[PDB]
């Protein structure tokens with residue numbers, strides 16, 4: 001069972017902000033990753049959030065998903081996971097811009113694809129896959145994380161247009177989880193964030209959701225296969241329903257992987 005005996009977790013250093021809470025490096029039967037919520041006495045609205053996330057993490061078990069160890073509430077609402085020695089992808093491609101190699105970038109693509117496949121089969125929708133929620137553990141293995149938004153405003157440049165247009169209270173879908181996977185391709189394939197030459201969020205928001213703006217797909221490393229090119233295109237396709245699902249994505253990647 002999943003509630004960790006209280007006052008069994010040490011926490012050392014602080015690492016950044018998460019989604020409900022803040023993240024820290026800590027101990028619990030080893031190096032672990034802890035995300036907790038400072039706030040002493042917290043909201044009905046907040047511990048909902050936490051009850052929810054937990055409710056979903058408990059359901060995952062799979063190499064490519066960050067591995068839920070436990071959760072506690074006394075003295076604070078804390079989620080614990082394995083520690084990833086390494087960095088988020090984001091932090092690779094755009095902080096220390098790691099010249100990675102093209103087979104490794106397709107591997108990362110495919111490992112993400114694997115994780116998303118797993119997620120969707122279980123009817124989980126991340127709603128916030130982005131290169132920040134992908135931690136690359138011992139550079140070889142991918143773990144999707146941060147299940148604050150998951151289920152059964154977030155980070156903008158991975159939002160599919162229909163999330164953006166905010167057409168009806170709930171416009172999320174495997175299909176949207178796919179549009180974000182496509183921006184992750186766009187980053188992998190181009191060592192870059194989309195829309196670099198625009199500095200006004202609000203504008204991007206508008207422009208993308210309305211269809212006027214979309215990733216310049218011609219910025220993609222030349223070493224890059226063209227099928228992976230066609231794939232990103234099919235992934236990003238503005239019209240919700242045109243986008244392949246993960247099983248088919250997995251397939252496409254795996255296929256062209258024999259090169």
Ligand SMILES: CN(C)CCOc1ccc(-c2nc(-c3ccc4c(c3)CC/C4=N/O)c(-c3ccncc3)[nH]2)cc1
Pocket residue numbers: 015016017018023033034035066079080081082083084085088135145146147148
């Ligand atoms: C914001 N500012 C501090 C600039 C510097 O930026 C940051 C750098 C790095 C990060 C960063 N978040 C996580 C993170 C995100 C979500 C969650 C966890 C860690 C643990 C449980 C969880 N649940 O959703 C990690 C990480 C995770 C696992 N292993 C190692 C690390 N790393 C966050 C911010």
